[PDB]
Design a protein around this nucleic acid. Structure first.
Ligand SMILES: [Mg+2]
Ligand SMILES: [Mg+2]
Ligand SMILES: [Mg+2]
Ligand SMILES: [Mg+2]
Ligand SMILES: [Mg+2]
Ligand SMILES: [Mg+2]
Ligand SMILES: [Mg+2]
Ligand SMILES: [Mg+2]
Ligand SMILES: [Mg+2]
Ligand SMILES: [Mg+2]
Ligand SMILES: [Mg+2]
Ligand SMILES: [Mg+2]
Ligand SMILES: [Mg+2]
Ligand SMILES: [Mg+2]
Ligand SMILES: [Mg+2]
Ligand SMILES: [Mg+2]
Ligand SMILES: [Mg+2]
Ligand SMILES: [Mg+2]
Ligand SMILES: [Mg+2]
Ligand SMILES: [Mg+2]
Ligand SMILES: [Mg+2]
Ligand SMILES: [Mg+2]
Ligand SMILES: [Mg+2]
Ligand SMILES: [Mg+2]
Ligand SMILES: [Mg+2]
Ligand SMILES: [Mg+2]
Ligand SMILES: [Mg+2]
Ligand SMILES: [Mg+2]
Ligand SMILES: [Mg+2]
Ligand SMILES: [Mg+2]
Ligand SMILES: [Mg+2]
Ligand SMILES: [Mg+2]
Ligand SMILES: [Mg+2]
Ligand SMILES: [Mg+2]
Ligand SMILES: [Mg+2]
Ligand SMILES: [Mg+2]
Ligand SMILES: [Mg+2]
Ligand SMILES: [Mg+2]
Ligand SMILES: [Mg+2]
Ligand SMILES: [Mg+2]
Ligand SMILES: [Mg+2]
Ligand SMILES: [Mg+2]
Ligand SMILES: [Mg+2]
Ligand SMILES: [Mg+2]
Ligand SMILES: [Mg+2]
Ligand SMILES: [Mg+2]
Ligand SMILES: [Mg+2]
Ligand SMILES: [Mg+2]
Ligand SMILES: [Mg+2]
Ligand SMILES: [Mg+2]
Ligand SMILES: [Mg+2]
Ligand SMILES: [Mg+2]
Ligand SMILES: [Mg+2]
Ligand SMILES: [Mg+2]
Ligand SMILES: [Mg+2]
Ligand SMILES: [Mg+2]
Ligand SMILES: [Mg+2]
Ligand SMILES: [Mg+2]
Ligand SMILES: [Mg+2]
Ligand SMILES: [Mg+2]
Ligand SMILES: [Mg+2]
Ligand SMILES: [Mg+2]
Ligand SMILES: [Mg+2]
Ligand SMILES: [Mg+2]
Ligand SMILES: [Mg+2]
Ligand SMILES: [Mg+2]
Ligand SMILES: [Mg+2]
Ligand SMILES: [Mg+2]
Ligand SMILES: [Mg+2]
Ligand SMILES: [Mg+2]
Ligand SMILES: [Mg+2]
Ligand SMILES: [Mg+2]
Ligand SMILES: [Mg+2]
Ligand SMILES: [Mg+2]
Ligand SMILES: [Mg+2]
Ligand SMILES: [Mg+2]
Ligand SMILES: [Mg+2]
Ligand SMILES: [Mg+2]
Ligand SMILES: [Mg+2]
Ligand SMILES: [Mg+2]
Ligand SMILES: [Mg+2]
Ligand SMILES: [Mg+2]
Ligand SMILES: [Mg+2]
Ligand SMILES: [Mg+2]
Ligand SMILES: [Mg+2]
Ligand SMILES: [Mg+2]
Ligand SMILES: [Mg+2]
Ligand SMILES: [Mg+2]
Ligand SMILES: [Mg+2]
Ligand SMILES: [Mg+2]
Ligand SMILES: [Mg+2]
Ligand SMILES: [Mg+2]
Ligand SMILES: [Mg+2]
Ligand SMILES: [Mg+2]
Ligand SMILES: [Mg+2]
Ligand SMILES: [Mg+2]
Ligand SMILES: [Mg+2]
Ligand SMILES: [Mg+2]
Ligand SMILES: [Mg+2]
Ligand SMILES: [Mg+2]
Ligand SMILES: [Mg+2]
Ligand SMILES: [Mg+2]
Ligand SMILES: [Mg+2]
Ligand SMILES: [Mg+2]
Ligand SMILES: [Mg+2]
Ligand SMILES: [Mg+2]
Ligand SMILES: [Mg+2]
Ligand SMILES: [Mg+2]
Ligand SMILES: [Mg+2]
Ligand SMILES: [Mg+2]
Ligand SMILES: [Mg+2]
Ligand SMILES: [Mg+2]
Ligand SMILES: [Mg+2]
Ligand SMILES: [Mg+2]
Ligand SMILES: [Mg+2]
Ligand SMILES: [Mg+2]
Ligand SMILES: [Mg+2]
Ligand SMILES: [Mg+2]
Ligand SMILES: [Mg+2]
Ligand SMILES: [Mg+2]
Ligand SMILES: [Mg+2]
Ligand SMILES: [Mg+2]
Ligand SMILES: [Mg+2]
Ligand SMILES: [Mg+2]
Ligand SMILES: [Mg+2]
Ligand SMILES: [Mg+2]
Ligand SMILES: [Mg+2]
Ligand SMILES: [Mg+2]
Ligand SMILES: [Mg+2]
Ligand SMILES: [Mg+2]
Length: 252
RNA sequence: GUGAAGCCAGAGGAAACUCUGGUGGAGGCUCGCAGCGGUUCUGACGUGCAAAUCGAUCGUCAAAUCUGAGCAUGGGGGCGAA
RNA sequence: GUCCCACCCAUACCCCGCCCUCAGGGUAGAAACGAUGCCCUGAGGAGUAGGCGGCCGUGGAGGUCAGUGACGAAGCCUAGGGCGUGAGCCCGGGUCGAACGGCCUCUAGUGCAGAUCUUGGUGGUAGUAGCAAAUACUUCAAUGAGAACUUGAAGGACCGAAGUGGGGAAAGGUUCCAUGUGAACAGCGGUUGGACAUGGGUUAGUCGAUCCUAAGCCAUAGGGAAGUUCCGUUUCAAAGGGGCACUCGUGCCCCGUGUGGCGAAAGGGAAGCCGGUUAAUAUUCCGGCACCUGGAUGUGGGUUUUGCGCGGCAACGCAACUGAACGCGGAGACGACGGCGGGGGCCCCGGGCAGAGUUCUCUUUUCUUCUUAACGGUCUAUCACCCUGGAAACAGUUUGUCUGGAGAUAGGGUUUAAUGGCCGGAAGAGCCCGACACUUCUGUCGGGUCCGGUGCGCUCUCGACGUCCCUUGAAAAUCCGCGGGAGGGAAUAAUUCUCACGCCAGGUCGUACUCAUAACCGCAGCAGGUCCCCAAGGUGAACAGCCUCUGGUUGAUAGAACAAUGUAGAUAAGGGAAGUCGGCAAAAUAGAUCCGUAACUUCGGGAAAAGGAUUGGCUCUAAGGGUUGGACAACCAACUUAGAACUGGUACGGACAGGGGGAAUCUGACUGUCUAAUUAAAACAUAGCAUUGCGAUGGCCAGAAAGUGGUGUUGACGCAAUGUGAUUUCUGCCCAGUGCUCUGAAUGUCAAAGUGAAGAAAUUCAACCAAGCGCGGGUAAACGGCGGGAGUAACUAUGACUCUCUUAAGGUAGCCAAAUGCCUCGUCAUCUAAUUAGUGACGCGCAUGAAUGGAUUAACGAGAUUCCCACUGUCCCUAUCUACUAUCUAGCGAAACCACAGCCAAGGGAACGGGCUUGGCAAAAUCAGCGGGGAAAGAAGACCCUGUUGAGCUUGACUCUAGUUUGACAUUGUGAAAAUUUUUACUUAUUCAAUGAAGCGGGGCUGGACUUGCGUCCAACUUCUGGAGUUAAGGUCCUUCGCGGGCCGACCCGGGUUGAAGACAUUGUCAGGUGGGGAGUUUGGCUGGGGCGGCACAUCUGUUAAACCAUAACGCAGGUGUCCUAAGGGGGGCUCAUGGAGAACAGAAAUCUCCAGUAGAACAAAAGGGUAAAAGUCCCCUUGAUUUUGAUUUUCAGUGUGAAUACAAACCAUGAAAGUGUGGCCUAUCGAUCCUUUAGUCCCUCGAAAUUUGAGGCUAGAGGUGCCAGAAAAGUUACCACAGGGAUAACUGGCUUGUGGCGGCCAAGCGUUCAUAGCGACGUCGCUUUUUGAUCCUUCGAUGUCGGCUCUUCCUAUCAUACCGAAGCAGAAUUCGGUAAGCGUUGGAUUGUUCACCCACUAAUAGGGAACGUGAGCUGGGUUUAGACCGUCGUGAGACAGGUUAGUUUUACCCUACUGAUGAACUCGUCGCAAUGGUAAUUCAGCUUAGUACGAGAGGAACCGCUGAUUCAGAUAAUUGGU
C-alpha cells in the first residue's frame, strides 16, 4: 500500500503552516525584575488582526528599564482593551482587564488569558477567542495554584505563573455558519493545506485502511487501539466509547 | 437581467407597524462575448493537419474564475475536491 | 443373380544386365601385391525419431609436389563440355588483375530456405492512394532558356483593431542587410526564398542586468552518520565598528544584544526627451535641450562675532538659515469590487485654411493636414487644517451617503495634489502647400501651420466616498523629518550652509531578427500548443455578428469536366415521430416595448413560467437642460422618451444577431471537481450534523540518527483523526460476536535478570513477576445485526386475541415490483386503438428501513426516464440544388500487404478447397465503381485452461519486521525512615525553560505596623491623563582649577545568570508482549474444459475380464485406518440352523424328551473361499503374539513398503503320544531419510594423559508423513501481466438425435346410428437438423461474439392464390386430401430482443435455410473491460449466469466475383440473322348474372360479360407538385 495522507502530513512540504502574513508571535514580556517585584506600565498602540487567528492581537509599547530604547510587544488582546489604554504588568499591578499579573496576586474566581504553564514561558493556556482560564484556588504553602482550563480540565501551576485579566477577544466566532465552501476555503487558506478533505471510504485500499470494497464501508471496527502502528491510526483513536452522547459525562 | 441590506418621501392607523413611489447596487445569482472546459452528433478524420486534431452543438463566465515566472515535495516515494 | 471363355496391368512373382551391402572361399620355397589389391560364388536392398560408417566442401598449420602464375593467380559470368549415384570435381569461352592449388597429417569461429531470425539492398502494389480546412484571382509589361505561385502598374478581394496590424517575455541563434546562385530543400514550378555562397550589421552614467529582499537554497558554530554526507541558518560560539594623536604605518580612547552568502530581465529601485540619421542600430549614433549619483574645492549670497535667520494670531511661509552620539516617526508598503467627480489621449460635431475625389444632374459637398516632448518658472486645482463666531423653527449635504456645542452653516485664509492655463524649451523643429536650379557636385527660396463645441462615449490615470471578509490582502535595501544638544564658530574676518552659479567623473555585460498557419515545442516550412502591451468608423446594449479606414496580405499544387458514392450547406407537396432502443439529427422559439403569468415554495424564488399584441418609411407635435436680460424673450446643447397623421408588400429585431415550452418520476441539495487520449455521472468535494484523541514531561505524524523535524509565529471558539452529507421531520431495539476502552485482587498464565534447593560443576528442579491475555464492566452517529410454528370472531374469508419453539435483539417510525422483488410482462386504476414502457395505489418486502442514515423536499442539473403542445425528410418515399472531392490531364508521388497464386459445382479430405478427384467450362490488354469471397489486414487471444511463471490488493494464511509497551542490567551518586523492599530528602550527573545570561541568596541601614520579662513580622518609594525620560546633576577630598582625577551618589557579602524536574526521566543492550503499518512466500492432484461435487490418491472381496496368468473407465455391489489375553497356542468331549411329535402353569414364542436334520448354523468386522469325533461349541492348561539372522512368495524395476510361505539356532506351551504352535482359518487392516526417545553390553570415541558427569557412536523398537515412495503453506483481482494450449471450454461447421419438431403402421375407443367423414389409447417403425443436449475433430502468433435495418436467392413440412378429389358437402360457410414454391405473405402499441401478446388492414398476414446469411454494409439497444449506485453474500480485498447509469465500432487503391464501360487481331462501313443467357406479372372489389339456382324458412353461389382497384415492372414530363 501507499503512505496515507495523515502520514504524509508530518513530512512538511505542502502541509507546512502559512507564515507570511503573520507579523510576530503572541507572547508576554520576558519575566524580568520589574514584573517580579513591582509593576511596569505599557501603552496599547493598536489592535490588529492576525491572519489564521480568530482572536485579535494588541501591540503594546513598554520602556526598557535598562536602556533608552522602547520595546513593542505583541499580546493576545483581551476583550475590552482599546488603543491608547495603559496596561500594567507585574506583581503589584492592579486587578483590571488587560493587566498581566502572577496568579499568586489574583483572588479565586477570576478569569485570565494566556496563562503560563511555568513562569517565564510567556503564555500557553487559554489564548483563543472567547476562551479563558479560571483561578479555582491557591495553595500558598505549596506555592501553587489550581486553575480550570477551557476544556474543563483541572491543572496545578506554580503561583508565579502570569496571566492577563479578562477574556480573550473575538467573542462567539463559531456562532455563525460558514455556509459556503468558499468561506471554509478562505478560513483554511491562511492556516494550512488541510481543506477539502476526502473521506477514506471513498479511496482505494492502496490509499487508506478504509480502502475500497463494492460498497463504501469501513468493513472493520473504526475504533483503533492506542498502540497501533503508524499508518493504522485512522478513525477513532483510543476511543473510550462511541455513539451519540445522550447525557452528562462523568469525565471532565 | 434580477434587484438583498441601508436611506428619502408620501399614505393609514391609536398604538405597533402596516402599505405605496422612489433611491441603493448585495449575491460562491442569472443571459451572454473573449478566456477556461469538453456534452452530443456516438459528425469529419481515422496509413489524419494532428500518436487526440477539426466542425457544429454545448458547460462556466466576477470567483472553489483563468494564467506567467521563481520556489518546494522524487519512486513503494511524491501528489491526489479520490 | 449364377456359370463359362479370352484378354488389360503394380515398384509383386519369374529370367537376364548393372550398383551397393552382407556372407563364404582362392591368391608366396612370391614370374610379386594401391594383400587396405585382385579373382570366384550366393543372398539381400521401404523407412520418421534415432544410431553407426564412408566420403565431399571451407578458413588456418607442418611436410611434400624442385607444383601453378603479370606470356595472367584469385574472384566473377556462361540456352559450352567431361567425370561422379550424390555432396561435388575438372575443363572451354568471356571479364579481370596478384596471388593460389593438389597430396598426407594437424586444427576449427567449417557447410543455411526458414528461426514474426540480424544487417544491407531491391520488388509487385504503382505512376496507384493521394497533393480538396483557412472565400480568389485577373490584365498588361519587364526579367529570364523556362513564369499561376518573381517584380512593377491596374483591377478584384480578405484580415476588419480579443487583426492575417505595430511591439515585447520565454525559446531560437544570425534566421537580420546587401550582392550572387549550378545542384539539393521550398511533397507542383521557381528567375523567387527563413535555402546555398560571399561580404556586412547590434554603439547607453539615464533602458535592463548589476543593488535589495520574498518563497526558498547553501555555508559557518555545533551535533549525527562506517561513510558518500544529514540536520542545523543563530542555534549550548571569546563571532564587531567609531573617534583622536605623531616627521614617520604602528600610541591610545569610546560604542556592541547580530553574527554570512545566493535567490526576481513581471516585486522594491537615482537619473533622458524631442528632431534627424543607416542597407541593416538607436530613449544607445548625430544636433539641440536636460537630469541623477559621487567627489572636490571656488565665486556670490545668507548667518554670526558672549553666537547658530526672519515673518504669520494660526494653519504655515520665505533662497539658505550649525548641529555628534542615542532615540522616535514617516516613506518604500501593498486586497477585491461598486457608483460618482477631475485630467490626458482617442472618437464625434461646427467654422476656417491648403490639397485631393466627385461633378449628365445635385451636393456652401466627401476625404486628408492644421503638431508641440523631457526638463523648468509662474498661477490655479477636491480632501484636509487654521481664525472669527456660536447653531432647534436644527442646519449643511451626496447619485449613494453622511457631518456638526469633541464647534455646523457662513465669512476669510493655509496647505498635499498637474497628464490644467500661460511662458521658456519652440519654430530655428516637424508637417503642408507654392515657385525657381540640375548629368552629378548643391537643391534653393517663398509662404501657412487656426478657432470653437459636445458626452451614461472608449482607454489610462488621479481623487473623495462606499461594500465584503471566521479572507484584512510581503519583505528588505534605500531616502527623509523630528526629539536631544556633543563639538565648533576673530568689530574688521571666517562663516562644519540641505541657497544660486561653477569644476571633475560615471566602469562591466545585453542591445540584430522572429516571437509564430514558416524563425519556439510538437521527428517538419505540422489546421495543435505557447505569457503580455496598444486598440479606428457604421449598425447595434455591446472588444456579438456583419461592412469599412490605417496597416498587412492576396500565401497555402494547378487546368478541364460536373458520373456514382461521399463531406459540407440547404429546400421540399400532403401527412407530422407512423422512423428509431430512444425525436439521434434537424426544424420550430428567439431582440426590444407593452399586457399577462399557475402548481409549489426554504417566501428568497418558480418567472423570460405559461401565453398575447406592437415593431418600417415619411411629415409633424410634446416633454425632459445651461446662460443672459426685464415672468417673457434671446442665445447655447446632446440624446432619451411619448403622442398623431400620412404611406406601402399587411411589410418592417426584413441580413446578422437571437430561450422551444409544459405535466411528472428516479437521483444528487445548490456553486464547484475528476479518469490529459473511450466513462462528467447518481462518483468526489462542499456547508451542516455527529463521534474520537490531546492541557505540552502532550496528541497525531516525519527521520538512519541527531543538541533533528512538521502541526507550531500553534494552546480546546485549537490541533489532529473519522463517518454522514443543504434545509425540514426524525434517527427505534440489540454489547451475545469482532473491535475499542476501563480493573487486573478473592484468580490463573510468563521471558530475561534476580531468589532458593540438589550437584563437583556444567546444569536440573522449585517458587516470584511487568506488560499482554484469560476474567469482569462500559461502548452501536464502532464494525455490524434486527426470528419460526399452530388455532381463533353468531355462513364464511382474514385474524384483533391466544398457544408454542428460540435469539444479543427479533425491523420501530417510515418507504417500495423503487437505481433495491427472483417468481414478474406481480395485482388494481390511469395513460393508448393497441403499452413487457410511465405514473398512482397494494405489500408475508427472494433480499426496503433509519448518520452502514430513513422519509420529504423549493431551487439548481450538457444526469436517467414517461407523456403532452409546437415543430420538422426520422419516416410514408423519395426528389432537387450549391461548393469541395472522387473523375480526366501536367507535375510530384507513398504505404499496408504479399508461400505460390487467383472462375465455379459436388466429392473426399484436419469433418466449410484456388490447387486434389470428377464434371461445368474456358479468348488478348483494359477503365470507373463495389463491398460476396480471399475462413482479407492489424496484434505471438485480453475470454477459458495449463505452468510446481508473476504482480497489485486483503486477511484471524505461513514466516518475519519498523515502531511501540513492559521488565532487567548500565548510566547512577549522597542521606534519612519504616519490620532485604517501600517512602521521601540532597544536588553535582542527567533533563526542561527564559534571558541582551540585571538585579538570585544571605545580611544591614531606613520606613512602617503588630505586640507588654521590648519582642517580632512586612517593605523599599512608578496607577488620574495616548507627553518626556539616554551621553548624571550634586556631596566629598585631590587638582594642571578644566562639564579635569578617584570614593559616594547607585549599602555590604557569596561570584550559583535565573527558574524548574532530579538520580526519576532520557539514553545503550538484552527479554516477554503488541505490531497487514510494512516485507517475503505459499495457497495439492485426478477430472468427458475448469469450478462445486466425488476420491476412481494407500488398500481389500465379488464382478466387468472375453475358462492359466495379465488387463481400463468419475464401470457395478460393497469394504479398510480397526477389534481381540483371547476372538492367540495346545488337548479332550460334544454337534449345529431348522422341522415333526410329545410334557402343569406354558400359549406363536420360556424349559424338558425323542426322532429326523450335508451344514441350510457358527467362525469380530465387506465379500468370496474353507471347516462336522472341526476350523463350530464347552471345558483344562498356557503365552509360538518369544530370541537370532538368513531363504522364498504377491505387488515388482524382480527396488522399497505392507503382507505372506517353508526351514534352521534356541527355550518354551500343550497332548500318553505322534504331533502342533513364529499371532488372529485364507484373501485388507498401514509408513523412509533427518531429528527425538527408549532397550541392549567387562562394546567403541571425545584425538596431550587420567577419573567422574555430559555428549557422541553400534544393534532393535517407538513418536509420521491418509497427497499414504513420505513439502512446513489463506484469499482476491472487473486494474491485471507473461510463456503457451485448439492436448482444453464459450460462438460456426462435423458425427449423433436422447430431447425438440414432423410423419407412417395397428386401431381399443369417440363419433346419435358407423373403428377407418373426421378424431383417436396401448404399442411400434421412421424422417429432420429451424430446439436443446452429448462429443471435443477444425480454429486460442484471433474466422469480429445478439438483435434489428437493408438485400438477394433457395427449400417445402402450402397461409393465400390456380385446377382437382372426399365429407357427418341442399345453398352459403367450412373441413380433409392431391398436383403444386409460379406469385404474394402487411401497418402499429410494449419489449434490445429472439420468442410473445394485443390494435388494425388484408386473399393471406405459412414455416424455414443460406458460417444460428448479412458489423472493411450500418447501428450499438443487449451481452459489455476499466468510472459509479443498490440489494444479498463476504472480516476483507471483493463476488453475483441480479437490477441500474456512462462508456473510441479502424483499413480496400490488391486478386477474384459482381455492376456497368473500352477494346487489338479478321479492310472499312450499312443492313440483318439468332446460338446461347435472362424473362413477369399479381390479387381483390363493384355491376350484371340474381334476390335467380338450392332451400320449409332464415338465407343464398357460380360460368360469360362490363368497370375499376392492390402489389410489381418498364417508360415518360402535356398537366399538377417539389427543387
Ligand atoms: Mg508504503
Ligand atoms: Mg470529505
Ligand atoms: Mg473509487
Ligand atoms: Mg491497506
Ligand atoms: Mg484494519
Ligand atoms: Mg455511502
Ligand atoms: Mg455564477
Ligand atoms: Mg475552449
Ligand atoms: Mg465519431
Ligand atoms: Mg448545420
Ligand atoms: Mg534402406
Ligand atoms: Mg578461422
Ligand atoms: Mg584468370
Ligand atoms: Mg595491382
Ligand atoms: Mg558457425
Ligand atoms: Mg539466407
Ligand atoms: Mg531447415
Ligand atoms: Mg490519382
Ligand atoms: Mg484529402
Ligand atoms: Mg486540386
Ligand atoms: Mg482553401
Ligand atoms: Mg524576354
Ligand atoms: Mg495563387
Ligand atoms: Mg471584409
Ligand atoms: Mg484589449
Ligand atoms: Mg514587425
Ligand atoms: Mg507581434
Ligand atoms: Mg527564465
Ligand atoms: Mg536574388
Ligand atoms: Mg517542389
Ligand atoms: Mg524543380
Ligand atoms: Mg532556384
Ligand atoms: Mg535567370
Ligand atoms: Mg534604470
Ligand atoms: Mg554593477
Ligand atoms: Mg546544510
Ligand atoms: Mg559537526
Ligand atoms: Mg542577490
Ligand atoms: Mg522591476
Ligand atoms: Mg547627441
Ligand atoms: Mg558671506
Ligand atoms: Mg509589492
Ligand atoms: Mg464610436
Ligand atoms: Mg508647450
Ligand atoms: Mg513655447
Ligand atoms: Mg515660420
Ligand atoms: Mg499554432
Ligand atoms: Mg462600432
Ligand atoms: Mg448607436
Ligand atoms: Mg505582416
Ligand atoms: Mg495543401
Ligand atoms: Mg414536407
Ligand atoms: Mg407544407
Ligand atoms: Mg401538427
Ligand atoms: Mg438534438
Ligand atoms: Mg432552429
Ligand atoms: Mg419574485
Ligand atoms: Mg415550472
Ligand atoms: Mg412568455
Ligand atoms: Mg442558450
Ligand atoms: Mg450535483
Ligand atoms: Mg484539482
Ligand atoms: Mg477519458
Ligand atoms: Mg487509465
Ligand atoms: Mg459513524
Ligand atoms: Mg462488545
Ligand atoms: Mg460486553
Ligand atoms: Mg497479570
Ligand atoms: Mg414494518
Ligand atoms: Mg425515496
Ligand atoms: Mg417492494
Ligand atoms: Mg412495474
Ligand atoms: Mg405501464
Ligand atoms: Mg437486510
Ligand atoms: Mg439493513
Ligand atoms: Mg441507529
Ligand atoms: Mg426539486
Ligand atoms: Mg476513387
Ligand atoms: Mg497527375
Ligand atoms: Mg512471388
Ligand atoms: Mg467450390
Ligand atoms: Mg467440402
Ligand atoms: Mg486459400
Ligand atoms: Mg480472360
Ligand atoms: Mg469500398
Ligand atoms: Mg470481402
Ligand atoms: Mg490471405
Ligand atoms: Mg498465444
Ligand atoms: Mg505439474
Ligand atoms: Mg507473488
Ligand atoms: Mg501490478
Ligand atoms: Mg520614622
Ligand atoms: Mg529539585
Ligand atoms: Mg534512571
Ligand atoms: Mg502487519
Ligand atoms: Mg503482504
Ligand atoms: Mg487440476
Ligand atoms: Mg472437486
Ligand atoms: Mg483371467
Ligand atoms: Mg466403491
Ligand atoms: Mg480362531
Ligand atoms: Mg484358544
Ligand atoms: Mg478338538
Ligand atoms: Mg504345564
Ligand atoms: Mg516408523
Ligand atoms: Mg520428523
Ligand atoms: Mg580421551
Ligand atoms: Mg516424527
Ligand atoms: Mg505417492
Ligand atoms: Mg481439439
Ligand atoms: Mg429425433
Ligand atoms: Mg388415418
Ligand atoms: Mg445439434
Ligand atoms: Mg469444439
Ligand atoms: Mg480461438
Ligand atoms: Mg488464424
Ligand atoms: Mg472475415
Ligand atoms: Mg425491428
Ligand atoms: Mg408437397
Ligand atoms: Mg391445399
Ligand atoms: Mg420464385
Ligand atoms: Mg443451423
Ligand atoms: Mg450469423
Ligand atoms: Mg461482412
Ligand atoms: Mg465493423
Ligand atoms: Mg449482427
Ligand atoms: Mg450487474
Ligand atoms: Mg450501461
Ligand atoms: Mg457520456
Ligand atoms: Mg323450393
Amino acid at each position: 500500500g501507499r503512505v496515507i495522507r495523515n502520514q504524509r502530513k508530518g513530512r512538511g512540504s505542502v502541509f507546512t503552516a502559512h507564515t507570511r502574513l503573520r507579523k510576530a508571535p503572541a507572547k508576554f514580556r520576558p519575566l524580568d525584575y520589574a514584573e517580579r517585584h513591582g509593576y511596569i506600565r505599557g501603552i496599547v498602540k493598536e489592535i490588529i488582526h492576525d491572519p489564521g487567528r480568530g482572536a485579535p492581537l494588541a501591540r503594546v509599547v513598554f520602556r526598557s528599564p535598562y536602556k533608552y530604547k522602547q520595546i513593542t510587544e505583541t499580546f493576545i488582546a483581551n476583550e475590552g482593551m482599546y488603543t491608547g489604554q495603559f496596561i500594567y504588568a507585574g506583581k503589584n499591578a492592579a486587578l483590571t482587564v488587560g493587566n498581566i499579573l502572577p496568579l499568586s496576586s489574583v483572588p479565586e474566581g477570576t478569569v485570565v488569558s494566556n496563562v503560563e504553564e511555568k513562569p517565564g514561558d510567556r503564555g500557553a493556556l487559554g489564548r483563543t477567542s472567547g476562551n479563558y482560564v479560571t483561578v479555582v484556588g491557591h495553595n500558598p504553602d505549596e506555592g501553587k495554584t489550581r486553575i480550570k482550563l477551557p476544556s474543563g480540565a483541572k491543572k496545578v501551576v506554580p503561583s508565579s505563573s502570569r496571566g492577563m485579566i479578562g477574556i480573550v477577544a473575538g467573542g462567539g466566532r463559531t456562532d455563525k455558519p460558514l455556509l459556503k465552501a468558499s468561506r471554509a476555503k478562505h478560513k483554511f487558506a491562511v492556516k494550512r493545506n488541510r481543506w477539502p478533505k476526502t473521506r477514506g471510504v471513498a479511496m482505494n485500499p492502496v490509499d487508506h485502511p478504509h480502502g475500497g470494497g463494492n460498497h463504501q464501508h469501513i468493513g472493520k471496527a473504526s475504533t483503533i487501539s492506542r498502540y497501533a502502528a503508524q499508518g493504522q491510526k485512522a478513525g477513532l483513536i483510543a476511543a473510550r466509547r462511541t455513539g451519540l452522547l445522550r447525557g452528562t459525562q462523568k469525565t471532565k
